[PDB]
């Protein structure tokens, strides 16, 4: 993350990092919504352009981690996936639309002080909280400065990175790019004439854009880091998958319904 502070120990118990088995590298960030379901961005698994198409045999889920590389023997829980559900009408070629995915764990994890899930939006919270101007916290171990042929010169961060970015009016997100923006993705970031910087970069993708409810006092995942046009570029904002606008598909896939 570009222009952020260091996350506190336990500041985000729902963070997950899609680790690659071999070679062992950080693919993306993820989010825990149940003891056996993990939410990510559909491009972290399926992206024909970058020849991306992982199997369940490719992935390894790391939960409760606060170091980038360090195997936290006593606090991080590693798990393995079972199935991988990618949205059917995912637009990986015209605008990365419906960029959301769900991974089922082959084992409900032992929830600790560090492994503790996020809440999904309810009609009221989506309505009350999701207002242009309202800030949303985004976490992730990705790039601290936009890089093409990437890697360390202190670009990647040691521990979790946090940054709170305000939401942008839709007409401004649309008039920010040339890509067909739908109502299945919103954008966030400080305007050029604004007094602050920051943004999600490469490696943070998949990660949760959360918001703390003021009426209720719990956290709500309002989006998932989908894509941006360069990290922290004046006049360009970060796009996130609208979690609430795609919630039905989450219910329809998890089947955690009426009771």
């Amino acid at each position: 993350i570009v222009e952020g502070q260091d996350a506190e120990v336990g500041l985000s118990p729902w963070q997950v990092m899609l680790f690659r088995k071999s070679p062992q590298e950080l693919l993306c960030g993820a989010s825990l919504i149940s003891d056996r379901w993990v939410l990510t961005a559909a491009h972290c698994l399926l992206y024909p352009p970058w020849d991306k198409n992982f199997t369940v045999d490719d992935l390894l889920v790391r939960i409760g981690k606060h170091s980038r590389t360090r195997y936290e023997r006593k606090v991080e829980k590693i798990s393995m996936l079972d199935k991988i559900y990618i949205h059917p009408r995912y637009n990986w070629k015209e605008n990365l639309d419906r960029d959301i995915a769900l991974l089922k764990l082959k084992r409900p994890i032992e929830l600790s002080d560090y492994i503790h899930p996020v809440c999904l939006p309810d009609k009221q919270t989506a309505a009350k909280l999701l207002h242009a101007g309202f800030k949303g916290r985004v976490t992730g171990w990705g790039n601290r400065r936009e890089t093409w042929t990437t890697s360390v010169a202190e670009v990647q961060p040691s521990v979790l990175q946090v940054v709170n970015l305000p939401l942008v009016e839709r007409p401004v997100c649309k008039a920010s790019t040339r890509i067909r923006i739908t109502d299945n993705m919103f954008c966030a970031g400080y305007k050029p004439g604004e007094g602050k910087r920051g943004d999600a970069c490469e490696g943070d993708s998949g990660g949760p854009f959360v918001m703390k409810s003021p009426y209720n006092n719990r956290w709500y995942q309002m989006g998932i880091v989908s894509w941006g046009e360069g990290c922290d570029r004046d006049g360009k904002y970060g796009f996130y998958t609208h979690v609430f606008r795609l919630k039905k598909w989450i219910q329809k896939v998890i089947d955690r319904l009426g009771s």
């Binding site: 062992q24 590298e25 693919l27 390894l60 590389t69 195997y71 590693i78 360390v152």
Partner: peptide
């Protein structure tokens, strides 16, 4: 997305 080596993990994940 690339590599600045990552520390050891219990290999019954790898095999």
């Amino acid at each position: 997305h690339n590599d600045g080596d990552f520390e050891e993990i219990p290999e019954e994940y790898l095999q």
